[PDB]
């Protein structure tokens, strides 16, 4: 989730 | 280089809980909070049940849990579904964008119900007839756990030709489906009596049977 | 949530370069960039190895490319090589809890020649009507790679309800076999005028219709  | 460290299996009893753990490092895990829990059925995508240590996705089961303690985060499972069983991955940031993924847990509902197979025998479609192929199929479906024996019968007597038999797979209601198959000739068809597919399972044998003797 | 919409099988001989796609639908893959793609070789866990449309993360080999033209991205691998087989993914990270994943394909370096699949349909039975009763099945055969996208179709209109497919089994000829299933009122049956198996396979794609009649 990208996250990043 | 190395990843997140995750048991093979983690059963708990239908009703109770399962914990999964991932641990990793000083750098991954143990470093952020960016700790993504994932499920993914046999053979569906992966699908996020957990983002960011503890939050769900908004329609994720209320009874999927988070936790990060050192280099270790953990999903509890509570409220054992049957539906739960699947492989789950943990993953985290680590350093300068990049993303480790755990090994992944195999996750089994211990107590599931034993179910005998539904059994659909069907004839050679109409339309198939007209351009000269016969197929017969045997749906064997919504039987646990995953094992059947197909046989095929000609009037009471064995067909090992032209007979092809899926391996079973898990259904959305986590029972198995699988077919056995026979190709035949019209002649074939319109020749024999009867053809049964003879679907054994846990002891018990269930055989139907169909008949050229379809109005047309 | 949704799936992005993949390719069920994508197949190269060693060498060659291939593409896979993801089409999504504005609503995450549509002029929105956390598009990432995954390597999920057979039975250990996924790796990104395309983050953000076309960057890739540490070690992995410049082979793989990334792009995305508005609502569909793509992922290239160039000097397909044996340890290439795997299943890919696509995701997107919208803004919130739900990161979508797309569909999963299976890219297959070709070990024998390519086949689409025969598709075959079968009507509810009578007898199976006689029990107030009725299951359709679709039997998907004789087709290499083995991945395949099956869809449904009440009366022209898609039809998610009462179906299931199973996952490729390998026939006895390495050749695949697959089914798939909807199961339904019989007035549910009568309620239409017609029903269709659509069944996805690399560059053909195959609907078969069946209908409603009344023999008996």
């Not at chain 2, 992966?46 to 769900?56: D, G």
């Not at chain 2, 699947?86 to 996750?107: H, I, M, Q, R």
């Not at chain 2, 053809?195 to 018990?204: I, L, N």
Request: a neutral charge; proline letters at 7%; hydrophobic letters at 25%.
């Amino acid at each position: 989730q990208x996250x990043x | 280089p190395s990843a997140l460290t995750q048991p093979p299996s983690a059963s708990g009893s239908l009703g109770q809980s399962v914990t999964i753990s991932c641990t990793g490092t000083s750098s991954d895990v143990g470093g952020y909070n960016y700790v993504s829990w994932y499920q993914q059925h046999a053979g569906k995508a992966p699908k996020v049940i957990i983002y960011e240590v503890n939050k769900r996705p908004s329609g994720v089961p209320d009874r999927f849990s988070g936790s990060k303690s050192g280099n270790t985060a953990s999903l509890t499972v509570s409220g054992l579904q049957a539906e739960d069983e699947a492989d789950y991955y943990c993953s985290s940031y680590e350093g300068s964008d990049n993303f480790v993924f755990g090994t992944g847990t195999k996750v089994t509902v211990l107590g599931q119900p034993k179910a005998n197979p539904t059994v659909t025998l069907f004839p050679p479609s109409s339309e198939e007839l007209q351009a000269n192929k016969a197929t017969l199929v045997c749906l064997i479906s919504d039987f646990y756990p995953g094992a059947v024996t197909v046989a095929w019968k000609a009037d009471g007597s064995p067909v090992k030709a032209g007979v092809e038999t899926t391996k079973p797979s898990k259904q959305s209601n986590n029972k198995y489906a699988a077919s056995s198959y026979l190709s035949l000739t019209p002649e074939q068809w319109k020749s024999h009596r009867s053809y049964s597919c003879q679907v054994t399972h846990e002891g018990s044998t269930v055989e139907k049977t169909v008949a050229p003797t379809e109005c047309s």
